[PDB]
Amino acid sequence: LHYPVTRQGEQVDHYFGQAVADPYRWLEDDRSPETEAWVKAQNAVTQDYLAQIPYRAAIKEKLAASWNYAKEGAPFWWGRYHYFFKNDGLQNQNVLWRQQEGKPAEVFLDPNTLSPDGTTALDQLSFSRDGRILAYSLSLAGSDWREIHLMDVESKQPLETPLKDVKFSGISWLGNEGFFYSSYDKPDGSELSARTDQHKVYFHRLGTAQEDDRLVFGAIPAQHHRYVGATVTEDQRFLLISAANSTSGNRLYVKDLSQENAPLLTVQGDLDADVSLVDNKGSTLYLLTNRDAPNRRLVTVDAANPGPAHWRDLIPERQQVLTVHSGSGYLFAEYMVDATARVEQFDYEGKRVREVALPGLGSVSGFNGYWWDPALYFGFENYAQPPTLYRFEPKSGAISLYRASAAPFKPEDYVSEQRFYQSKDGTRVPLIISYRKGLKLDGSNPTILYGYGGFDVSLTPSFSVSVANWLDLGGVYAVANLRGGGEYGQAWHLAGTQQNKQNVFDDFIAAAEYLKAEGYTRTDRLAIRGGSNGGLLVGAVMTQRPDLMRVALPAVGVLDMLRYHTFTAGTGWAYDYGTSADSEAMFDYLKGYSPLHNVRPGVSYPSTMVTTADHDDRVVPAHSFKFAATLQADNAGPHPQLIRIETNAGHGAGTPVAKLIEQSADIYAFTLYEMGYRELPRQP
């Protein structure tokens, strides 16, 4: 195969006086004709390579057929209608239906009719208090930017002109007058790569132009923050404003709306802890926080004097990480037991009502609703169990099956076992391994090891049609709960941040070694995969241990650790990574593992397929571009170093089903082909 010619520029950067060359700096210009031509040439080479794989079409057809089944979400009531999402099978975007008593259900909002390719996705949905107006945000081509649209709920007629420049925003109504939302001023230069660091809260009053929206927070110097959010409590009495500069830690303010021109009181004035409002009962605020609680706790405080010195424990911290949901007048404490969910019901006085028995070991969704909801709904799933919906009557605690999955996958056909392997420093790290029953530990099973490792994100069991198919093809899927994650609280998270980041990579390498030693797989039958921070994980491991695996799959990864903070809102990740501008120590540490700066000429890298998207403004595609360019120039081995750039897609959220199916097919076909399979291991 012949890689497109990639020009090498003369750009040289300096860090504390130390020079570092960046020959592919020009690829950072997402709007230049030169960069666009390179993307087109790279995709052509990749598609040409994939075209030689005999079973790629079979994998795609297998995926599509198995994906083709009815899906339905939990219903939610508002106004005279009960709303619920549905997908009859292969619709690119889920459709919002509604139904009122005594009448048949009807389509209310179909995102598939909003674009030619299903690339416009529905994000936030927020009804006015009287339920007559709906404000919803849409994503175009998958980018983080948003537009908020207004619609008359009964007639379905569009109202006003959509609001623009919305990003990382919720939509919270003040009665029926209007709503609060967050926005960044349109940056000069490419909105897809330019830096944005001053998030502001605005209030849109119905019947006016966006230019007249009242600026609520974030304009004056004292309020400059990279991330801000505003929410009006269910009872309309309080306005909560959160403000942050990084993905961990935030300030929180509260304003009494029942009091004419009340002042903004400080719930937490520093960024040393995360704190969010779960709900409120009168002037009593219920806050979830990790302040002085690594595994988090639930506290209460009166809105009149909400400072941390006055917070009082309602649900004390335990050895397991806590998350709190509220609904039907109850608080639901969801605890993480080795990455699996457990639920306990509490009243607002903090008295335990009962433990809610779950269908098994996995992840749960739901348990969220309004104080008046007569019933709550929750979903359960894991790697071998498709989403199942249950109805829960809070007072009696009665649980009933609301909707069984219509998926063609039979849970009893798979094994999903949890093991705890030993990392380099001795730390025991969780690993959940899934596969079809009948597996032999002869070290020959094609295996995909997946990880993330960072930002306090916990990888709890989740069902994926793509994964189930990998298992049906005879593969093994293993997910490591690496440090940097939030599985075991703040201590687990911090052990993988800044100058401890290498621990995350050591944890992943040890997972690969465990899988080989136990006989699940072997070097030439192993592939590693990860996305975003997980893409960094794969890039770092493949540059440090190119001999460890046969295939590397870094998706939308942060790969240039020296300049990542110079794009969009990347600086918000400094809490986890640190920046090259922090100090010589941080600069050396970052340069020490930065995938882009650790690719070396003469090294034989594993078969690699770098994936990214042209509208990914979360993690600019330039990371992947420069990394792929470097691998193609430096790799000395016989394995292909390809890059697949998805068009009209972003970081991942809201990607239409058709694109998801194509991506998985390409990835699994490439993986098996690079492992030397002439035919599929199992009948598709």
Side-chain angles (χ1 to χ4, degrees):
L1 76 178
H2 301 67
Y3 301 123
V5 172
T6 304
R7 173 176 80 75
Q8 290 184 52
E10 305 182 301
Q11 178 65 48
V12 177
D13 298 308
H14 296 79
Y15 300 90
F16 295 104
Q18 175 177 165
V20 176
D22 200 43
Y24 305 117
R25 175 56 135 273
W26 58 274
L27 285 171
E28 283 186 19
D29 186 346
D30 57 328
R31 294 187 300 186
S32 78
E34 176 176 37
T35 294
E36 305 181 313
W38 185 86
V39 167
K40 182 177 175 182
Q42 290 291 169
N43 267 338
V45 169
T46 293
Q47 286 307 308
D48 173 60
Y49 190 88
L50 296 178
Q52 76 190 295
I53 306 171
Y55 43 72
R56 175 166 65 140
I59 292 171
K60 179 183 158 171
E61 294 189 318
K62 178 182 176 63
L63 277 164
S66 67
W67 203 301
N68 194 193
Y69 60 87
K71 301 180 191 61
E72 195 179 313
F76 52 106
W77 177 30
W78 198 279
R80 67 169 70 194
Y81 298 103
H82 278 296
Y83 292 86
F84 55 93
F85 281 99
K86 301 205 298 72
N87 191 307
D88 52 46
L90 292 173
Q91 299 182 278
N92 283 152
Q93 298 295 331
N94 294 327
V95 178
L96 183 55
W97 290 66
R98 72 175 175 187
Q99 190 183 191
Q100 71 178 307
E101 214 175 77
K103 295 181 179 179
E106 60 166 356
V107 170
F108 171 66
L109 185 53
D110 190 341
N112 301 289
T113 62
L114 305 179
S115 68
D117 51 7
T119 57
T120 288
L122 174 58
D123 180 8
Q124 297 298 291
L125 224 56
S126 190
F127 291 92
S128 60
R129 200 149 167 80
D130 61 15
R132 298 181 179 180
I133 305 296
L134 170 65
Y136 61 96
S137 66
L138 297 176
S139 172
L140 307 179
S143 97
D144 281 339
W145 290 100
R146 302 273 185 282
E147 293 189 310
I148 291 173
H149 287 62
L150 287 174
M151 177 200 304
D152 175 70
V153 169
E154 186 59 19
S155 72
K156 284 178 283 193
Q157 178 194 295
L159 284 35
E160 296 176 39
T161 176
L163 303 184
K164 38 197 178 183
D165 298 324
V166 177
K167 191 161 182 166
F168 306 141
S169 178
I171 301 179
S172 189
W173 288 83
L174 178 58
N176 301 114
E177 325 176 11
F179 54 80
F180 293 94
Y181 66 92
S182 300
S183 162
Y184 289 115
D185 290 352
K186 219 282 185 177
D188 43 55
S190 180
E191 59 175 56
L192 299 179
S193 59
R195 196 177 310 190
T196 53
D197 61 32
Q198 279 182 48
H199 215 198
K200 301 166 195 172
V201 177
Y202 286 100
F203 181 73
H204 180 64
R205 182 170 294 290
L206 289 186
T208 67
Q210 179 173 17
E211 62 184 302
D212 303 309
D213 287 2
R214 179 170 63 79
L215 198 158
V216 181
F217 181 93
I220 65 182
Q223 298 182 344
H224 289 180
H225 286 82
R226 177 165 293 96
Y227 307 109
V228 301
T231 310
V232 179
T233 53
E234 190 177 1
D235 62 19
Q236 302 299 112
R237 187 173 174 182
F238 299 108
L239 172 68
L240 284 288
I241 293 175
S242 67
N245 284 138
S246 79
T247 51
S248 283
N250 67 284
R251 296 187 165 99
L252 186 61
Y253 305 100
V254 59
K255 182 200 293 177
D256 195 319
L257 299 170
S258 68
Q259 288 294 174
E260 48 196 0
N261 296 57
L264 250 189
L265 269 31
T266 300
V267 185
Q268 185 178 84
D270 60 58
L271 299 169
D272 305 316
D274 299 277
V275 59
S276 54
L277 181 82
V278 172
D279 191 17
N280 72 292
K281 189 175 182 179
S283 56
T284 302
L285 304 176
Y286 290 70
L287 311 164
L288 176 60
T289 186
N290 63 9
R291 193 186 187 78
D292 299 310
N295 298 314
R296 298 216 288 286
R297 57 172 171 152
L298 183 62
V299 306
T300 59
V301 69
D302 191 81
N305 188 45
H310 306 85
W311 296 357
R312 292 294 174 282
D313 280 4
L314 186 66
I315 298 181
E317 171 193 27
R318 306 183 71 76
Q319 303 176 216
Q320 299 75 45
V321 172
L322 170 79
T323 63
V324 181
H325 308 293
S326 67
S328 306
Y330 292 104
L331 294 172
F332 292 92
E334 183 189 321
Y335 285 104
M336 192 150 56
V337 177
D338 297 330
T340 61
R342 297 294 187 287
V343 178
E344 284 182 50
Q345 186 182 346
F346 286 87
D347 57 47
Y348 279 62
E349 278 66 59
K351 176 177 183 177
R352 180 175 152 298
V353 175
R354 65 171 68 87
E355 177 158 355
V356 186
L358 299 178
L361 293 174
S363 294
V364 295
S365 62
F367 283 110
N368 284 117
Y370 300 112
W371 186 287
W372 59 80
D373 292 327
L376 296 174
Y377 293 92
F378 71 87
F380 174 80
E381 62 179 283
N382 62 39
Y383 295 111
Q385 173 67 68
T388 303
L389 293 182
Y390 295 92
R391 183 174 179 288
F392 179 68
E393 197 290 292
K395 299 180 179 179
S396 68
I399 292 174
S400 62
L401 178 65
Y402 177 67
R403 185 176 184 281
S405 178
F409 301 104
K410 300 176 63 179
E412 60 262 44
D413 288 346
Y414 312 98
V415 168
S416 206
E417 68 185 320
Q418 185 173 59
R419 293 288 181 279
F420 299 82
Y421 64 89
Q422 209 173 189
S423 190
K424 180 181 181 180
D425 67 19
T427 304
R428 284 282 169 182
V429 180
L431 184 68
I432 293 182
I433 310 165
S434 305
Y435 49 86
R436 269 247 176 180
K437 290 180 178 178
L439 187 81
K440 302 302 180 179
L441 301 175
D442 53 21
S444 71
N445 309 288
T447 301
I448 293 174
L449 172 62
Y450 183 87
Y452 187 69
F455 300 83
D456 194 49
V457 168
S458 293
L459 301 188
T460 63
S462 62
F463 185 75
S464 166
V465 175
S466 296
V467 172
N469 270 280
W470 175 253
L471 307 187
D472 289 346
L473 287 176
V476 173
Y477 192 65
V479 178
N481 290 291
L482 315 164
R483 277 175 291 178
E487 292 87 351
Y488 294 109
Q490 187 180 61
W492 196 248
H493 178 200
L494 297 178
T497 63
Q498 302 199 177
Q499 292 174 59
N500 290 140
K501 185 66 176 182
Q502 181 59 46
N503 286 338
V504 183
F505 310 144
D506 292 335
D507 285 355
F508 204 46
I509 291 168
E513 290 170 343
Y514 177 80
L515 291 169
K516 296 182 190 183
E518 294 308 299
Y520 291 95
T521 190
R522 66 191 183 226
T523 304
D524 60 41
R525 286 287 164 82
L526 176 66
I528 58 169
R529 178 168 192 285
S532 205
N533 167 249
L536 158 58
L537 167 65
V538 172
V541 174
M542 72 176 284
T543 45
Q544 281 175 29
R545 299 292 307 281
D547 61 299
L548 186 69
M549 73 306 274
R550 185 65 190 73
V551 185
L553 305 164
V556 291
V558 183
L559 301 161
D560 181 336
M561 296 310 296
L562 299 184
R563 295 176 53 61
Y564 85 77
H565 65 293
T566 68
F567 304 102
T568 57
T571 292
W573 314 325
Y575 181 89
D576 264 75
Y577 306 145
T579 78
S580 53
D582 294 359
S583 63
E584 295 172 314
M586 195 68 251
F587 160 67
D588 287 332
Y589 196 91
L590 286 168
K591 179 177 156 52
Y593 74 79
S594 180
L596 177 64
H597 305 89
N598 283 282
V599 170
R600 306 180 311 180
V603 174
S604 179
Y605 293 99
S607 293
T608 306
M609 177 146 94
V610 180
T611 58
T612 187
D614 58 21
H615 284 67
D616 187 349
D617 61 323
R618 179 73 61 80
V619 178
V620 298
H623 282 287
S624 292
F625 294 171
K626 299 204 295 179
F627 184 61
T630 305
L631 289 173
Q632 292 180 347
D634 296 357
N635 184 48
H639 306 134
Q641 309 298 312
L642 311 176
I643 180 171
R644 180 183 187 292
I645 307 95
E646 182 67 73
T647 62
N648 300 306
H651 199 56
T655 301
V657 169
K659 286 183 181 298
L660 297 178
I661 292 175
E662 295 291 2
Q663 294 170 183
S664 281
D666 281 355
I667 292 290
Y668 294 158
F670 178 75
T671 301
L672 293 178
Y673 189 68
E674 289 312 298
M675 285 179 187
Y677 286 97
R678 280 171 282 161
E679 297 101 51
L680 289 175
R682 290 229 315 162
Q683 187 77 45

